[PDB]
Structures are given as structure tokens and as C-alpha cells.
Amino acid sequence: TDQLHGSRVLVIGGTSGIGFAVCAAALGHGAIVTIVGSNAQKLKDSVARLKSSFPSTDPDDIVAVRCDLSNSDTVEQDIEKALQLAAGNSKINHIVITAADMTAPPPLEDLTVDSVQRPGIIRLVAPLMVAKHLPKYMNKCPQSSLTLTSGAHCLRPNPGWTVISGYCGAVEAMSRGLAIDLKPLRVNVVAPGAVLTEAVKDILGDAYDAAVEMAEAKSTVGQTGSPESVAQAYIYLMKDHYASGSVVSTNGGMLLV
Amino acid sequence: TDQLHGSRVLVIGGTSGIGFAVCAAALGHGAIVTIVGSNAQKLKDSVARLKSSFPSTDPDDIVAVRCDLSNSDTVEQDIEKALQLAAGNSKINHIVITAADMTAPPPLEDLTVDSVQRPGIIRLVAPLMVAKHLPKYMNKCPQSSLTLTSGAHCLRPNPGWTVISGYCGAVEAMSRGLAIDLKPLRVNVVAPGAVLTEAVKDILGDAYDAAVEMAEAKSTVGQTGSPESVAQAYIYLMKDHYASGSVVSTNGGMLLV
Amino acid sequence: TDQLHGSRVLVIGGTSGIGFAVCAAALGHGAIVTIVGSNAQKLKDSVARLKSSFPSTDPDDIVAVRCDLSNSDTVEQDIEKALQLAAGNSKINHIVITAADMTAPPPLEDLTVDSVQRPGIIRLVAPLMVAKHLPKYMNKCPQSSLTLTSGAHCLRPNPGWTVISGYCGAVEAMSRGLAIDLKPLRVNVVAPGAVLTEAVKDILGDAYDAAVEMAEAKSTVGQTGSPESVAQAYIYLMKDHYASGSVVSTNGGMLLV
Amino acid sequence: TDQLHGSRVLVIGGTSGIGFAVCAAALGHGAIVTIVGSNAQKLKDSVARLKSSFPSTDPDDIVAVRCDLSNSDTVEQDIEKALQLAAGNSKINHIVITAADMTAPPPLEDLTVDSVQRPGIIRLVAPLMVAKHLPKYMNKCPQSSLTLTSGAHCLRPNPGWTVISGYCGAVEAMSRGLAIDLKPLRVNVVAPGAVLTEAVKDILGDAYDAAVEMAEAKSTVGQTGSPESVAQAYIYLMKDHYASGSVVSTNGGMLLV
Ligand SMILES: NC(=O)c1ccc[n+]([C@@H]2O[C@H](COP(=O)([O-])OP(=O)(O)OC[C@H]3O[C@@H](n4cnc5c(N)ncnc54)[C@H](OP(=O)(O)O)[C@@H]3O)[C@@H](O)[C@H]2O)c1
Ligand SMILES: NC(=O)c1ccc[n+]([C@@H]2O[C@H](COP(=O)([O-])OP(=O)(O)OC[C@H]3O[C@@H](n4cnc5c(N)ncnc54)[C@H](OP(=O)(O)O)[C@@H]3O)[C@@H](O)[C@H]2O)c1
Ligand SMILES: NC(=O)c1ccc[n+]([C@@H]2O[C@H](COP(=O)([O-])OP(=O)(O)OC[C@H]3O[C@@H](n4cnc5c(N)ncnc54)[C@H](OP(=O)(O)O)[C@@H]3O)[C@@H](O)[C@H]2O)c1
Ligand SMILES: NC(=O)c1ccc[n+]([C@@H]2O[C@H](COP(=O)([O-])OP(=O)(O)OC[C@H]3O[C@@H](n4cnc5c(N)ncnc54)[C@H](OP(=O)(O)O)[C@@H]3O)[C@@H](O)[C@H]2O)c1
Ligand SMILES: C=CC(C)(C)c1[nH]c2ccccc2c1Cc1c[n+]2c(c([O-])n1)CC=C2
Fold this sequence. Notes:
Shape of chain A: globular
Protein name (chains A, B, C, D): Short-chain dehydrogenase/reductase phqE
Structural class of chain A: alpha/beta
Strand order of the largest sheet of chain A: 3-2-1-4-5-6-7
Strand content of chain A: 5-15%
Pathway (chains A, B, C, D): Alkaloid biosynthesis
Transmembrane segments (chains A, B, C, D): 17-37
Oligomer: homotetramer
Number of helices of chain A: 9
Order of helices and strands of chain A: EHEHEHEHHEHEHHHE
Bound molecules: NADP nicotinamide-adenine-dinucleotide phosphate, the ligand C=CC(C)(C)c1[nH]c2ccccc2c1Cc1c[n+]2c(c([O-])n1)CC=C2
InterPro entries (chains A, B, C, D): NAD(P)-bd_dom_sf, SDR_fam, SDR_superfamily_enzyme
Membrane topology (chains A, B, C, D): Single-pass membrane protein
Number of strands of chain A: 7
């Protein structure tokens, strides 16, 4: 008797990192999960590793579709097709969007007009395209939810990441606009702090151990966030039929020191 | 394997409304719950309704204590007594504080020095006495949590409830200080919107019908919040081992209209 | 064309530090200023320092009265006395409240019920007593303003000042309620960061030099705040007839490092 | 003997509305002002109306440049040209950015990938291009400032304006990143509420008299905002050498009802 059992959850960005943990958490509650990513080989491994963790579950409750949401001529159709597949002959109950490139941007001296606009494709256009088309594949009711992702660097930005912190503030304001545009559907944002995903190990390279320590030190929990803890923020937003227009911040007290 | 199965949960203010729903939710995860309130027979009726809804659980896992937390002479000893009792032969894992007087304040013209300071006994002293004494009954680790209660009236005050909005802002700011003082234990706040508890009908009396309608209209969801929905925010904070220093706002989008 | 020329401004806490700079700044615009403080000796030095710096100004446009606003028997009378004096045969145009005890609080193992409530007299009751009685001495119009004082430690608390952070959080929520209670009169808050007042050397004593340069190092400006500069935040709120319900944070980027 | 005398102020977007009122305020303090807009006839009207209001002023203290910053081909080059002219034989002291198209966006039903990305050139790319090049034309010191513009719809979105609310959230978060990147130069944001500029009268058309009554009614001041009033927030940020990373919200208390 779990409230998320019959429910269909679409995770855009669920092939690795935080979004992948949300797929795992939703499956533990008995949900039907649809996963979206651009990497065909990450997509394939994601689905296999979830079936290994949940062998009881029907494989037809774990479906995956490949979309490159960074291409303007394709974002809109790939969003619509992923909404169609997540719905089946029913409607989607919850959508989660963690998808992002997370590659270090250029410094200020090399800043080009395309390096600013290119991230807005996946971070801004794709979520607005989800809102444009979700009414045909979702019921606009308070039991259904759309959740976007932001970060603590919206408020305490990292050096050289001003453009991405800008886009994190855009997602937060945007979610409030969508909570009105799509009312009574619920729209919220999760703002995570330092989460040790495999993408963050790639950006940091050989500076990974010096940045982890620092992160650890500049937090009240004295820890980095595990994807399985941050994933509970997304589950909470699916279960609280009264949460809309909010930011759920999970950052280990990082904003207090 | 649920992290809240063996866990000891102290709900200060769990005899009615939001706190009671938090006990039901915690028991649903199999937790051991200790309840605190001032009304001796609200105590035995609350406990009886949870044992009847969860006959699976041993009856010695639902315990209640009576405390008057509005009385400065006794606040500290009754807090220490409730903490000793909820810990048992073990330590406390999570504490939730929803306790509040819930009596209509005077309008500003008839403001008296006592009407300002008396609400601070249950709203400020009682949580600080918990923080003062919990290290002897709790492990200061990120797996443990203390959660206080705030409200949307901190940002959209309700005329003339300026004094109560003041204390909600104090609770939010005090929780951030406690996240520093009690680290690496986690301290957070839940800020509910309009929750139709049986207490709010007493405060409103015959103007309840009209208020409800206004509250449903000032929201994206077109409804008031159920206590069992808002209770999921408290459950989320117990399970997200990375959340500290944060505010979980569940208000139905009322801050957006 | 200066609109603070004919202006009557009451600065509660204007004998030293930030409040004193607001009196100096207001006098520079030619306003009539009334000062409130507890120290008798300090009051007559305050006015002597302003009359020498503004000798053209009629010395009767600089008045001071002594009140003990930490004092429950007298807070309301003293407030009514100061409002009556600043109004004269006219009305007060702007009120600024910087008054605070500025005494180091106890650590949390010796927290007393009185150490929680005793700061609340000057920080919460006195401004609420100003709001109660100001309608008889002010025109409730958008050209008039009430400005309270908070701090950046409301969001980044300083250990162990959790209680003082609580009251700063209360002042921020109280201002918003009073912006509604006293509409269309304007109510706002200034939240300063690190300002080297002579009181701050008293609190820290011999630890002053290790904290200053640590305050200077953990700021974007790399400097501590001058009472000159933060005083301009109060002047701004007096001149902007559209600012109400807001917090002016002047903190040198300290929430950014 | 005024702190803005002789000071060089660059106002990007100063031909109409809020920015023009900032130009007027600055000239009253004796600053040297450079005005930027795209409309050649608005620029020549700007300067003529400021010279008539300040005939004492040297005409060489009022300089104007025409730039279309909505086009990626020239935005960076034209920004550099505007910085070079505002610096002259000296360095720029303060930069203010109000520039934006202020044209109603399409409804969500017709949302196109280009309607989303196009406002980001003037709203995001141009400020980042200013930050990229201002160090050769400004001293990075706490007495100099860069101020951007946001809005109250970032927190209370206006229906159908979700995309613009996103960009205002991006500007608030980007200013914080720039307060870090440009340190110790000061970066802040002004977030205005409802200001009846001639651009707003254009969007509303025949709905102007019904929208003003709605704006005046959902405010504590019972008024729309004056451009003259809102401009004092920008002047304040130029004079407070301790303000950095902050948002000055001037909205008439609209976030409170
Ligand atoms: N890790 C942290 O500490 C942290 C902190 C704050 C905020 N965040 C934010 O949380 C979100 C996820 O972060 P993460 O650590 O979990 O990184 P991640 O593992 O790389 O997750 C990003 C997801 O987005 C997908 N994706 C990337 N590009 C795509 C594209 N063109 N089209 C479709 N899908 C695409 C990726 O799948 P494919 O690779 O298959 O395309 C991946 O599943 C990001 O917004 C991040 O900025 C992370
Ligand atoms: N309901 C809403 O819409 C709403 C909105 C925003 C914020 N809140 C806040 O959420 C919290 C709970 O609200 P609620 O609607 O659930 O009201 P509630 O049902 O009356 O819950 C209050 C709990 O605290 C206990 N309590 C009250 N006074 C006490 C005292 N002196 N000593 C010990 N225990 C005491 C009560 O038990 P006893 O009666 O036995 O004493 C009760 O269990 C409150 O802080 C409220 O201000 C509520
Ligand atoms: N300095 C900082 O870094 C900082 C940072 C954040 C917030 N703040 C807040 O800014 C405000 C002023 O700080 P400050 O540095 O300017 O300290 P300050 O110079 O000591 O100013 C405090 C004012 O309040 C008066 N006062 C103290 N006790 C009083 C009492 N019982 N009754 C009436 N008046 C009393 C004082 O006058 P008497 O001595 O004559 O009583 C004085 O004029 C305070 O609220 C402070 O909490 C300061
Ligand atoms: N008015 C309000 O109620 C309100 C509320 C919240 C936020 N805001 C924001 O405050 C800022 C100013 O608003 P406003 O009412 O003052 O509107 P406005 O009068 O239209 O001012 C916009 C300025 O930006 C210039 N501009 C527009 N496009 C340009 C382009 N491609 N290249 C160069 N300059 C360009 C305009 O000059 P040209 O016409 O010559 O190109 C004009 O001077 C905007 O960011 C607005 O969104 C306004
Ligand atoms: C948002 C646009 C509309 C058309 C709704 C609008 N409606 C109005 C009614 C009265 C006065 C001004 C307006 C405006 C202009 C305006 C207003 N606001 C912001 C902004 O960017 N532009 C940010 C917060 C308010």
C-alpha cells in the first residue's frame, strides 16, 4: 500500500548521478519508470543495473528512450515522444528533470555568445517544452507533479561557473511561473549541494581529493551528499500533494558556513 | 530494510493535527514514537487511535507524556523528562516540534508586553531547551535530525498576526543557528501553509467557512493541505541525511498568487 | 530639491555606531533628528558631536532623550515619550530603530529561560510598542517610513549567537507584518554585515584583531563595513516611496564567500 | 561636495523608463553620464530633455551612444565601444543595466525555441560581455559598482510571462557570480515591482486603466511605483561601498498580499 505503486514516473536525466538514484528510489516504491538520456550505452547499463537491483519488478516497468535534448531542431519532438512513451495508454504521474551537460564552461576571457546560449537549450528550452506538451499526457491535478533541478551555487556560486549559476536561478524562477501556468499541477525544484557523482569526478580530475575535503569541511554534516539521500527530495515532492512553488534544498548546511 | 524501522522518534506536539499525522506516518515506517502534549486526555485518545490503526506494532512503542511547555517554571524539566523517556535504554534518532499555543492574538492597539513574550516560551524557549539537553540523549550524527515548525505567514503575514509571524521568523533563523551549534546533527524547518486541523476551526469559530474558501482560492492547487500530506515533509527530513539548515515549504503555491 | 530637508527623523539607538551615522547622514540632508539611548553621558556627547559637525543647523533640531528600552515596566511609556517629543506640533516622517543590548549570550549548556526572553524586550517589544503608538504621531502615508535592523547572521549565524540570530529572524518577519498592519505607511529592514563599531570591540575584547581580518578576508569587498556606508541603506529607505516589506542587505559579499 | 560629483556613470538602457530616471538622478548629483539605447531618435530626445532640466550642466557631461545589443553579431563589440566612450580619459565608476525589449512573449501554446533564447542576448549575454571587458575601463575596487535589473515577477510570476521570470532569476543569480568574478568590484541587482513607464503603457494598451487599479490594489502602499522612486535604489547602490551580492527590492509591498 504505497502511494507511488501504480504511478508512472518520467526521469529526464536518469541514466547517471542524481536522476539515476531517483529511478532507483521510485522503483523501490513500485513505480513504473521511464528513463531519458543521450548516451545509448549509459541508457543500456542504467536499465540493466536497475533490473539487477529489482529482479522482482516486471521489466516492462523499466523502459528507456534515447533523446539528445541539446539540439534545437529535435528537442521538441524528442520531448513529445518521450512523453508519449512514458504515458502508454494511461497518463504520466510525475516528471523529474535533472538533465544537464555539466562540463566546465570557459573562463570570462574566452566567453563567447554561444557558450552562454548553448546551455539554455537543455536547461531552459527542454523544461518549457515539457510544460508545453505535458497536458496531453498528464492530468492537471494536485496529485501530479513536475520537478526541476537547481543547485546551491545559485546562492553561493562557484568560481568560473557564473553562467551555470545564472541558469540555476532561471530554473528556480521558471518553476514558479510554471506552477501558475500549469496549475493545479504542482511544480517544484530541488537545489542540491555537493553530490559526488561520476560527472563531478570527471570535471575535477586530479583536484577531486582536494575539492572533496573542502566540501566536507564547509558543511555542517561534514559530508558530501549521496545520490540516494538527495533522491529523497524528489520522492518527497511526488508524495506531498500540497507542495508547489517551492525549492527543496539538500546541501548539508553548506549555506551556513 | 527501512532506516526508520528501529528508530526512536519524539514528536513534541503530536496529540493533534500535523504532529499526530507525523506519528502515524512514522509508525507506518515501523518507528518507535513518543508523543508530548499538555492535554491529559487528548494524550490517551491520540495513543489509543494509533494503536488501533497499527495493531501490528507492540503497544510499548507508542508512549505519551504530559507537559505544559507554555510555563517557564517547568519547561526545562518537562523537556528533559520527555527526552529521557523517548530515549529509553537507547538514544533518540529524530525529534519533531509542532507545539504551539494556537490562540488568536490581540490587535495591535491592545498590544501588551505579556502578549509578546508569553508565546516565546513554547515557541523559543522549548526548542532551545531541547537543543540544550538533547546531546545527552542523542548522537550528534547526520543520521539524526531535529525539525522545528514555521509557516508561510513568515513571508505572507496574516493581519493582525504580526507577533506570530515574528516568532515563525525566529524559528527559521534559530534553526540555522542550531544547525551550527549541534553539528553534525541535522536541524531543519517545515513551513506549512493552510492546514485544516481541528485546532484551526476552534481559532476561527464561525468564520471558518469563509476562511477556508479564501485559502483554497489563494493557492495554485485549489485546495487546502491535508495533515497527512504535510506530514511527509517531516518524514523527508528524517530520511535525507544531507538536509540541514533548510526550510521545507509546503503551502499549495499560496506564495505565488 | 531635497525631500528630507523639512523632515523629522527619530533614530532609536542613535548615540553610537550605525544609528549615530544615520543621524549624521540625515542631518547632512538638513533633517530634524531626535535621538534615543540609555546612557546619559553618551547622549550629550552624541549631540555635541553633531552640532559641531553641523553648526549652521539650529541646535534645537538635534534633540536627545534617554530611555531604557530593555526595561519591561517602562518600555511603552518611554516609547510614547520619545514619539511625542519627535512629533512636536507636527508629525514624525521617519523612524529608524538600531537599539540593541549587544552583550555576548551564554553558551547553550548554561542557557537560561531569562537569557532567551530578556533580549526580546528591546528587540521585539520596543518596535511593537512603536508600531502601537506611532499612528498618533505619524501620518500613515507612503512618504513616511519605519525601518528596523537585522543582520546577515540571520542567514549565516555566528556561534554561539543562536538566540540573537533568532531575534534577527523575528525582526525580519515582524517588519513584513507591520508593513501590512500600518499600510500605507512603509516598513523595511536593514541587514548589515560586519561593521566595526566601538561596541563590537567591547564584545570581543582582546579577540578583536583576529576576527576583523577574518571578517575582511571572508567578504568580496575584502573590507569591513564603515558606519558611513551602511547608513546609506537607511537613507535610501527614507527616500524611496515605493519600498515596503523589504530587506536591504549591506554585507560586503559576506554571504558570497 | 557630493560623492557622485565628477563620477562617470554608464546607463545601458537609459533612453526611457527606469534607466532614464537613473540618468536624471545621477545628473542631479553632478555625475558624468553615458546613455545607451538602440533607438536613434530616443537617444537624441533623452539628452535634450536632460539638458533642459539641467541647463547649468556641461553638455560634455551628457554623452549618448546608439547600440542594438539584441544581436549577437555586434553585442560584444558595441559593449566594448560603449565602455570606451563612458571611460573617456578616465575610468568608469558605475554601470547600470536596465536594457530589455519589454514585448509580451508568446503564450505557451506557440512557444518556440527562438522565443526562449532571443531575450537572453540582451538580458544575459550583454551583462556578461560588460563584465568581460569592464576591467580595462574600470578599477576593480569597492567604490565602483555594477548594477543589474531583475523584477518582482521572479517571485510572483505574471501569467504568460514565465520565460521573462526565468531571465530575471538568472540575472539575480548571475549578479552573485559576478560579485565573485569581479571582486572586489561590487555587483548588485534592483528588483522593481510595478512601474508605470511608457513601455508598460504600450504592452497594456486598452487594459491600462484596469491593470493600474489591480496593481494599486495588490500593494501595501496603494500605489504604483514612481520611476523617480525606483531610481533611488540604483543611486543607493552607487553610494554604499559595502553593498555587494545583494538585491534591492522596490515593489510597494506587493509580495505581501
Ligand atoms: N552532482 C552535484 O553535486 C550537483 C550539485 C548541484 C546541482 N547539480 C545539478 O543536478 C543535475 C544532475 O547532476 P549530476 O551530478 O547527477 O550529473 P549527471 O550524472 O551527468 O546527470 C545528468 C543527466 O542528464 C543526461 N544528459 C546530459 N546531456 C543530455 C542531453 N543532451 N540530452 C539528454 N540527456 C542528457 C545525462 O544522460 P546522458 O549522459 O545519457 O545524456 C544524465 O543522465 C544537474 O543539473 C546538476 O547541475 C548537481
Ligand atoms: N494548521 C495550519 O494551517 C498551520 C499553518 C502554519 C503553521 N502551523 C503551525 O504547525 C504547528 C502545528 O499546528 P496544528 O494545526 O497541527 O495545531 P494542533 O493540532 O493544535 O497541534 C499543536 C500540538 O502541540 C500541543 N500543544 C499545544 N500547546 C501545548 C503546550 N503548552 N504544551 C505542550 N504541548 C502543547 C498540542 O497538544 P495539547 O493540546 O495536548 O497541548 C498539539 O499536540 C503549529 O506550530 C502551527 O503554528 C499550522
Ligand atoms: N556592528 C555590526 O557588525 C552589526 C551587524 C549586524 C547587525 N547589527 C545590529 O545593528 C544595530 C546597531 O549595532 P551597532 O554596531 O551600531 O552598536 P551600538 O553602537 O552599540 O548601537 C546600539 C544603540 O542602541 C542603544 N541602546 C543599547 N541599549 C539600550 C537600551 N536598554 N535602551 C535604549 N537604547 C539602548 C545604544 O545607546 P546606549 O549605549 O546609550 O544605551 C545605541 O545607541 C544592532 O541592532 C545590531 O544588532 C550590527
Ligand atoms: N517597468 C516595470 O514595471 C518593471 C518591473 C520589473 C522589472 N522591470 C525591468 O526594468 C528594466 C527597465 O524597464 P522599463 O519599464 O524602464 O522599460 P523601457 O523604458 O523600455 O527601458 C528599456 C531600455 O532598454 C533599451 N533597449 C531595449 N532594447 C534594446 C536593445 N536591443 N539594444 C539597446 N537598448 C535596448 C531601451 O532603449 P531603446 O528603446 O532606444 O532601444 C530602453 O532605454 C527592464 O529590465 C524591465 O524588465 C521593469
Ligand atoms: C509583467 C508584465 C505585465 C504586462 C503583467 C505588467 N502588468 C502590469 C501592471 C501594472 C504595472 C506594470 C505592469 C506590467 C509590466 C511589468 C510588471 N512587472 C514586472 C515586469 O517585468 N513588467 C515584474 C513585476 C511586475
